[model samples]
Target chain A: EENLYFQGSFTDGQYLLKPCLSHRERDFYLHIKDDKEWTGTGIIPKFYGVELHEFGFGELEFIRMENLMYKYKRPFVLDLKIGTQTWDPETASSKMKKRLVVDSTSTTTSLGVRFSGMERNIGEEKPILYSRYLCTHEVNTRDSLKEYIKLFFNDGKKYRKELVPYFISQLDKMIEVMKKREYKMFSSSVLFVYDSTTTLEDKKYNCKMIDFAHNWILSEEECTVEDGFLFGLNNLKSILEDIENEFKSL
Target chain B: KIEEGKLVIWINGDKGYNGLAEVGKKFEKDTGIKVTVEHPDKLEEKFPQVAATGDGPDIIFWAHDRFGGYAQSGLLAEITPDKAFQDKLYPFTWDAVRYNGKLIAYPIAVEALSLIYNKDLLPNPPKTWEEIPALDKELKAKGKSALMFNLQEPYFTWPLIAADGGYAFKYENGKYDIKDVGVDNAGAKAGLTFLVDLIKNKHMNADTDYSIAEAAFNKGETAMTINGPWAWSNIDTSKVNYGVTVLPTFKGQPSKPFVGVLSAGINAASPNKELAKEFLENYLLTDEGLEAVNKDKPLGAVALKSYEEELAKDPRIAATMENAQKGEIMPNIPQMSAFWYAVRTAVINAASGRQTVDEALKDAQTNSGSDITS
Candidate 1:
């Protein structure tokens, strides 16, 4: 019922549960659910539609986005907020202003995407969670990003170099589809989850875009793809490919 | 809607001058006011000379980044247009115009550098800085060369120069902390070394001005160029089929370019202050007036809400808008003058083999402080 890596999200075993936090958040799934291109793409999670459930008082509405971790026993999760401008393009109230400088300075380190949150494996017991602090502050430089990436894809005993290229291929398709549209996704993140079990000879991996509290479909008047989410996916794809090359050459 | 005598304007290029002249013809018919516009040579050089003596055009046009020096010299008339009209523009466009708590100028359009590659020349652009070498390798088949930009110019190269982490000033909370200068940091060192390494391998040779790079790209002799949408007016439409994308990444990281606004301001020294405001706010900046101004010469990404639907349709304009949204707005403060000279020295010194990146950057930082302290 708890998401190990990404906080604020919970699950009920079968479906990921989100409390329809934003108007855009709830409508985005409905917008994409009906579209063949978005639904057909394996990258976006299978939407089970919004359902009203009985909780403490009268009614609570929760989104039922598919859970890929259900397929694997032990899975390591990574979340990256896409686009250089992580804050909403539109104006806001009090708390949003604090992030004005933060969002600017955080992505100011290297690329369009920032390391939002992730799951780090610890001593012999189980995997531990790396706070959002490490992703935004510590993993700033490319050298740091590369070194930190080694932690997610590779533990002390195993190297999942296979997942690197697998995600790279997925991002390429994602970029191709995104660049052709008029959508501007701000503060949105992509989720990468992979099986980390040593016993299984064949491991599985999944990549899906998540979070849309600040995403907007640009009017035809504002249509343009200067880097948008494409910038994040493009850089991520390149970085992963570079890591793949480094491991192969070694 | 119609009340006028005459207003004089100083513009840069012929296209915009002609565009304004067309807008003025109708302006005279409505208001009985004659408008004279000129693309005078060395407008910047001539401006201060006349301005100090309480004489200049009613309006002067240029980028907002360069206006801080002019505004500081008591040359620009402070303006206050209707707030509703101001609200209609993209908020980022205002960052360049507002200086020291004054909205010193009015925005015309926004511009930022991007990687403009000829699709026929390089169907696929290099995803990282290291991948750029492949451009020279592949383009060797024909007589064409690879990438070319004004490498010594800080404005054109900041994205690639700041790839590892570099900046003119630490901007935060809608202002610049000029105390936090980053031109000499270790990250700047890495980014400079990256560029210096590429310079040694290619024909860039520190390059000439934007025109040298523009000529090569326009004629198809160069595969790619790093420039702004201001170059679109002179593009050889028959020769190049281009795509505007994110500037190439360095160290597998994204390049953060500087975004600026092209703007028009009233001359503080002009006698027609009230009439000038009337000409700009009621006439020139109107939807019909801007359409006339944008006809012969399109303002890259519009600064007004009315032009968005008509202008964003151009793929090039849309791409520029996209990049500008994520880019750093160059500090509109007075210290920006020092940043250009210091960075220019750092880039030129390192690129020409006169000094190492470490020495050049250290000197740049030291030299930049002299201006700040004064």
Candidate 2:
């Protein structure tokens, strides 16, 4: 009821609370916590804790992660579903069939990076939010998708190419970590959070991998890298590289 | 160091060729080389047929936008201007003359479209488009309209489309990616809505060219029209008490027109390429030579960073140049041929109710020959 997320997600200023939909997700958060590379790199949000508390509905389990908004005076957030195919082997049930059809029609299958939503801030006091309907339903071509990504990095006036290298570097790091792990992250997203403010200190913007509803951790020997997740990540990387080359000199 | 005694140049108009001929006199006197200025009827059509045979003007006095085709076909040679020369001209002017990251011509004069208001009627133009409907209503009672322009032509209508961020193609990686067309983007839809609204209110399908609107403005019949420095002379001769200003914002969005550049390009086929280069670099581009050419034809907005003080004295020059700085240089690409036809068709169709705004733009994208997957 407070702010925005994909579905059934709520925020209460300090932390983001979402219904723990997956049994494997509880263990997934714990698995990443012990891995030094995953936690130390700041790829994901600082996992606060999980609780089984509710006010509006019946008592349900909720996972509380660090609120991405409270860090900056103005936070620009972009949530993109990071996968070419929406469904995988384990998740290929009744609901997955519909999502697969939806994915095939949109840029989810074509470009791989599905634009879930974005919130761009104009003034410090009031940050005007944009709906996901335009980006999700409309963007299907290479040029159309490029413009949306360009708008995200721009501080409403000019592009911040300085931020381009940082985001690209994070994607590089994400690939390196994902390449080593044997897991599948379907119906997942790469959430980009950054602030455009006076920072002569030279700051680092953050992008996190989220939405682990359909994630299935497999045996290390049988399976290789998350081809499902990496397919989209790799494609998104290519798109970013395209934008990087175009505006590099500019 | 091939020192040739003769060099030739092509110009279309009396004032322009006349100005170049006067400038040539100075360069010829300084360098001991004879300069011939030719008035070609159709320089664009006739030059290419004969240019491959290696017998034509060493230079072409024309607008910069057409040179990309010339350059690709090897009719034009690239000029390497030194850092000092590049620094001494307006930054945006270079964009017009550059093709595939190479300098195809030396931009001499630059201007972009701006709002032209009849000072006799509305002394002050409205800042936002909200006032236009009421103003149009008031003007209608007096057997007139508040505004009119070349709505049929793509060039004139681009500013209206660009107000909401519409563009023909993306110039990326030091070249235009003609494959990526943006005719059906959100901005295109938003911009075309205004044109649709305008047609529903007053203006119509027939008699929508700039010449018609220009004549109407000159007669003091229309309160406002859109034009640039090229239209200034005619408006001056007609003695229309006019005021020049940046096109007013529509729905809080500023209309960004394409900047037009008059240029001096070297002919690739000519033997006196170095000699023509010498003329451009040493004599013609000098402060004295530019001033001499500017005398015959008013250089409304000189491309030189250090501009003519007298030219800037004209408030119209100053206002238009200021607006030009805010605009993008029209992309000089070969694929722009198809784009012009498509967008112009879209504007006409949408305006005439022959097609809806969405349908017109969708058809525009398909006809544009861009890489949009079905």
Candidate 3:
């Protein structure tokens, strides 16, 4: 197994330092090479490049990739790997207990996003989410219920109404990225989402395709970009719509 | 300008090159075409750029699974071997080499899982998993462990799943239907239950990884183990008299291993297409050329029938052929990429009793469903 290390602002700013296995090195170069030829919007995270790290024992190849979460500076993040058979041993076993910040007297007006139909692990932490998060179907959670109520109480129905259209537009842009690259977004390609904006009204969000190690780049006709993106978008839409329905009931 | 007298073939690793180098010399003398068999440092990483820019090798030797991405991208030239030449190979061999109904490579070697047993300890190999327990008791009397393998690894465990009629995907109309995943089906669950029972009974351990299993087999501590041709070299043959045979049956069905075909594909950008085809189709397809390639390790069962007698003489190759005949062609589609780890997890999870067979399989099915396209 190759050594994989992640550091925040290690060299310049958020970068993943990974063992430069020959195959992964090839994957990194191939994506960049293909991206250059297409001359379109870059769907993948920017590859910072590679270097040889020599230690007393031996030398190893280390690749640097732009840390997607760095710019947000403690933004709500989700390290989502979307695909049909997305749960591997690593992700499936990575369940964590959700922590609640309960000071009944305190009123900070906590803003959180909620989705009714999204399938969620029972014990995963709120604000920042890791592990395998597939946009395949609905996920139900009491936290999502509490967050939905909180959003309604603080921001009201109109604010909730404005949020839906913006997120729908964002999903459209995400689908467009998948389509443009004709990328085979497999279980290996993780979707990194971070909310950069301070206020929920601003709703500044970024979604970038991060691990290209096992993804495939296909020809225009051979690409199943439509199926991949549409499935993903629809899954996201269901979550937003479920939230919308809750507001409608209110 | 393309070198008139020189020809180049890119092979992946170091071990297989000397055999090809010998063939190159013979070809150089016969056709006056100097053949250079080069092992690229990082061929998989470098091939796309090199092939796209038209500077790749005239011929490339690799596994069939990789052909899909390159063939679809138009980096490969379709080499249509004649019916006579094609007739020499196994049906599954052809199935593996083709991409989108086009023959993308010329198959040279076939590898699959087979039961390797210490002949002195067990004169007659068990025909089924049911017989293993009886044989295990006899072997234990002689201070040897029962049948064993890398139980943690999915590749070794897949044959049992297949014997129970579980499949990764359903093949239809010459294409794999990704929608029909059978990993967690009744057959798969039955297979998983059998495996889990073994672990529970102390017949095998969940911790038996590849190296540990291989070491035990090599030490003659185990009477039988399921492994492929690649593991033959490491086994201490001097200490133990060994024989190879097909995997034991389970519930009236024979265990089927995944057959991996090693083949040669012509680069589309090559100026020497005719020469590359001549070397691959006519020469490599012949028994002499096949022997040259197999001289090193007898990589797997060769395609041509002319070498049947030759390969049969070697017990190892013959046993591989028997298993290959009962095996499923390793699907070359890109979607097969998702099946490996997902199925592996289910097998390990189920075997360790961390999850029920049904839950493990359902999880595998769901995980496999994440793959959108075949």
Candidate 4:
């Protein structure tokens, strides 16, 4: 799995530098078509502009992202790729395990497991997704993971009532965005779940669907962006529902 | 009788003139040749045009990376350095000054990026790249990051790429295999991904360039930054107590920065070739002369072992030496002109989340035009 998604911000906070390795202008344009239309839930980090710098050995490209990460003084971040498969650390390859940076406070795992058809399962199955999660916070502590883990054990009622509904609504908004924009791809898109309690006392829990690098436009006959997003929404909704149910049972 | 008592040299960068002025005066005092050190703006663009017209300086002082382009244009004079002279310098210094098996320049000093950290901010610098983000969070209230480097620029970011297993080309048998471009390799992606996480997590910001990053560090706003010796002059010593070390390791692999050698190349068209050679060989390369040159501006590690030993006495150069020992030579090929901009964009793109590591590197590989039939 790729450790990071894209180039980080430079000394200048405005421009988010990206490699011009792949041609994603068309995809970016299509996905971010109705920026204003995907408003209200306060999730989508606005795509500002993109500039291509073609010189010397290769072309360097950068896109301006509104930096939703900047909204929080000290935010807890979770990069989740919504897919099926109960990610098992013990079953992970030694190479993957070696790459994993595990510490006392954190538990880094591939949120979705890789497909292994060798296993004997009941019925027809979808290709197992290999999405990972790097859940942490702005501080050195593992409070973010602790809080997320808390969703499983601490307050079952709170997990079902508060966190579950909040994430579901965000997924709903994301699905709406895909439909309105006519997006075709969803597997590649990153789901960013953030909560910052440092500066803001209310502890703003927000989620944003980002990275439209592979998003494609849907023809009139095909399902719009919403359809592709549904492919992911179903997977994510079920996963969260399972968590909610598990917590409620406990 | 082409001006028997006169010799000319051109220098660049902030302290180049002052450093060379000391050597020029000493040479003039010893040989009766009035050495004129010229520090012209836009020297890279100006040198070839002026040298071809037969009116350029006898020697040009600049980074060796440009030597290949100059040598290709037939503007550089190939010098045969004695075995003793070669023995005095670090091996990579010699490597950087060569083009097509020819010694194109006399390397004066060497530089590579080091992890510059604030002693107070990060008492014990991060042992691994994994620890840096945690440091950034712990120090967030003070407006400090664990590491601050220019993500938009390739020079600072190349180390991360190399650590990730991305290389510009496969270097073998004393030559770079240009066809073997590895910009988008898995290792490179891994390296770039680490940087992207820093930005995405708000450990660092995008609005930082060299000046901004340096300023932040000088003011004690940030804990650490990756920069070269050239930046040392700007750092406020009194306010910021800093230390230099090799860049933090990523996973288990070490970061390898591009080590650049500053050198002096004689113009092939120079009428006073012997005089230039004498001035360079007897004065600039000597212990006394180099000592004077580095007295005010210690740009980087000196080529001569004796000089390097002397400078290494300072803790700063020791840190630079540590990183330099583990550094890769900045490719001095003509192809590098194109490689730099491509990699610069790759760093920015990968860092900004506009493209994935594979996507960004793949694009860079495609655009790099690395298959140059030299």
Q: Which candidate is the best by TM-score?
A: 3
TM-score on B-chain, cand. 1: 0.89
The TM-score values for the models, in the order shown, are: 0.56, 0.58, 0.63, 0.60
- lDDT tens digits, residue span B228-312, model 3: 8888776755467788887899998989888888888888878888888888877777888878877854666776677865787
User: Where in model 4 is the C-alpha error above 4 Å?
Assistant: A1-250, B1-5, B141-143, B370-374
DockQ of each: 0.01, 0.01, 0.03, 0.04
lDDT of 2 at B221: 88
DockQ of 1: 0.01
Alpha carbon RMSD to native, model 3: 15.4
Better of 2 and 4 by lDDT: 2
Top lDDT model? 2
- For candidate 4, lDDT tens digit of each residue in A68-149? 5433333334554432222222224754443334311122222321111111111234322222333322211224333343
For candidate 3, write residues A60-105 as lDDT tens digits. 5566666555434234434333443322222223331111121111
Q: What is the interface root-mean-square deviation of candidate 1?
A: 26.5
Model 2 residue B322 distance off true place after TM-score fit, in angstroms: 2.2
By TM-score, the better pick of 2 and 4 is 4
RMSD values, in order shown:
24.6, 20.5, 15.4, 16.3
Model 2 DockQ, alpha carbons vs. true complex:
0.01
Tens-place lDDT digits, model 4, residues B207-260: 678878877788887888899887787785646888888788887888988888
Q: What is the interface RMSD of each candidate, in Å?
A: 26.5, 22.9, 16.0, 11.2
